[PDB]
Amino acid sequence: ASKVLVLNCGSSSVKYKLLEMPKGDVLAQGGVEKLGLPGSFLKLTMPNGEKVVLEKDMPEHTIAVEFILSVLKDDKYGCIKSYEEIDAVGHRLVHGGEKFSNSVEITPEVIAKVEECIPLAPLHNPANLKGVVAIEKLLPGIRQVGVFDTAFFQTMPEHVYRYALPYDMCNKHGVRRYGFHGTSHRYVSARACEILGLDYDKTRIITAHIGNGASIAAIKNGKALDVSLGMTPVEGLMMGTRSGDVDPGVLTFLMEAEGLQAAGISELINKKSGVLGVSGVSSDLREIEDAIKNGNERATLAMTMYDYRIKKYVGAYAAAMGGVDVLVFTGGVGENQYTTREKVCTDMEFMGIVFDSKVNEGMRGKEMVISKPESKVTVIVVPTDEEYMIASDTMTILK
Amino acid sequence: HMASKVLVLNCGSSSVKYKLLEMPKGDVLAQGGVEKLGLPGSFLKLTMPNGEKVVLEKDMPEHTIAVEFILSVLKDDKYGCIKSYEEIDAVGHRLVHGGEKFSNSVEITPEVIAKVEECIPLAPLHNPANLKGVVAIEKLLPGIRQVGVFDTAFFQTMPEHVYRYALPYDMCNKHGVRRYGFHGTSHRYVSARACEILGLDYDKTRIITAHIGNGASIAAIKNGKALDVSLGMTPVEGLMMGTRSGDVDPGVLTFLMEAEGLQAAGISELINKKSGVLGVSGVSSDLREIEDAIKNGNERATLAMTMYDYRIKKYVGAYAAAMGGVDVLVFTGGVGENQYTTREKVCTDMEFMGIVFDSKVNEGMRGKEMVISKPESKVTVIVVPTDEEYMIASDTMTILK
């Protein structure tokens, strides 16, 4: 039994959980917000479910992480008596480029390579490293592990990861598909196989991480083959505010027609598009659901579009792998939006899916098979746990 | 059994392709093309009844002079197939873009020209040339009636959840941003022709049609109506092509704009002219030249083709899922009709969705109507060479009835 602190550091945030391993019990969870801004604060969730908001000036990451640690140890809000109870720290690192294929113990050599990947995630990797530096200062001699969002997808072959763009220009600028959500795809694919009694290394898996950001992956015989996200997180599925796949020529057309530059078109496809952009209602699928009940036709259209594009990816990735054994739904939307799951999996008998509509109906947030027993393809809901996956890699590496 | 002769034109900014067809059989009486129209070195190349190509050099600075030369060749004692222009019963035209105004072919009247002019913004380098052909014919052939047949028309049955992009609603509507599709006349012809060959009811069949040429598109046609198509508002979207990228990460485009200091026009040129098979291979946009480079162990050429086949395979899966299954997969176009190795890579390891492929029948099979799935395959896979000119001539005869 060990306690592992798991961090996710952003430009103006630190999200944390403290996990008891190997069970994965959450001892603490919270987040610092508005770090480096006036009115920085920490919000935590107590074991009994109560939310607590603590204001404190936190101008940079070290002071933020120091406050988190003091809260963990507090006699009122805390869950540990001493920092020595924390056995290790695991970090979400966004981008491992072509340098990392798996999680690693953080050494100076590792930090240097993560710094080399900063150009591939310039607004994420620096903050992630600030978290590592904070822990070296505040918990000296504790060992730390880095777990990369991109690493799982480093098995993709060049015919998948290369775009059909000018060869030299792509190579010069490191343009290729990387994928994100890799920690989630890794966790739910392996978890599904354990639940189902299958050998991970002999199974063809499609994993659909549908949240505010959405991605789908093809995992064949234990190695990722393809993923819907690209070099950037705008590609693939329709998302909350991101476009997903769009005609490249539409982008250049809108640049001329609306007088947008690179930055303007980037903001449009990342912030004003997807479910929000079509619906004119919300990026939140629950608010869409409500708007649909009040007969909002644009909200209905957004959801029809959303479901359709997931369905097409399921077909595409089955074709890419030569079949599929397991289809996994995960993420905030995948775990909860049973109507999407139904629309995606119905009329898919031609490729081995027989769906269990009655079991699926109303089914939110549990691990559950939602295909009929006789389905050739098993369809399963697996709530993701990226923090647990990080803690699990941490314990394996530091063993 | 009576016979009409229909001249079918396909006019581009620097070309006029023509065929003269005898209807309703669809027998080709003549075929050729003017190239380098409006440039030094303009010429007409035609195909004799004997099958040889003949090149007639002639200065042709614009479309009317080009069409006049074409007509003089049709009537020539040596090269011709008619004694006089009165033998031409009608003219049909390939018109690229009908926008949301045209769902099927129409007689070209002043009112139709006005509407086709309104669609010029949607195909600014094609529609103008197409109309120049119409004008040339009205000048050169007294009394002649003309019909327009639109590359976009077949796809006007797509539902909004398919044709809308997940972009700001009002901004798309303001600028007419939506999926249109192209090659509609080809998809229309081969889907119907496949069902005729196979004894199937077109209106109850789920069909995937892959028109693989220098431009490449794949379509889902369900129960007699187009449902989806890989080409977008623009012909860059979807499949990897000769010089066009196909689908790419929208964020890669904005990234390259900043990284290489490109504006809209520069990015547009890159994805239309420097990408696709040409861009990856570093060899050619021509798949025969790729094929050769592969034999000489060019690894980039091999890579280009692996990428090309993979993306077609993914669309086949996607559109089967979109339709709830597939009854018939059709290969067509210059590449689809000829590149049997692509067909094999696409259709092998697809038994999970009902395709059992016949590798031996497929091998070296070029340019013929031919089933290439095994008899026991649930899904029929068929090569159907396209005949857009026949489709155009057929619509022409229906309208001018």
Numbering used by the authors:
A (entry chain A): 0 to 398
B (entry chain B): -2 to 398
Paper text:
Porphyromonas gingivalis, a black-pigmented Gram-negative rod-type bacterium, is a keystone pathogen linked to the onset and progression of periodontitis. In many bacteria, the enzymes phosphotransacetylase (Pta, EC 2.3.1.8) and acetate kinase (Ack, EC 2.7.2.1) form a key pathway for production of ATP from excess acetyl coenzyme A (acetyl-CoA). Pta produces acetyl phosphate (AcP) from acetyl-CoA, and AcP is subsequently converted to acetate by Ack, with the concomitant production of ATP through substrate-level phosphorylation. In the current study, recombinant Pta (PgPta) and Ack (PgAck) from P. gingivalis ATCC 33277, encoded by pta (PGN_1179) and ack (PGN_1178), respectively, were prepared and enzymatically characterized.
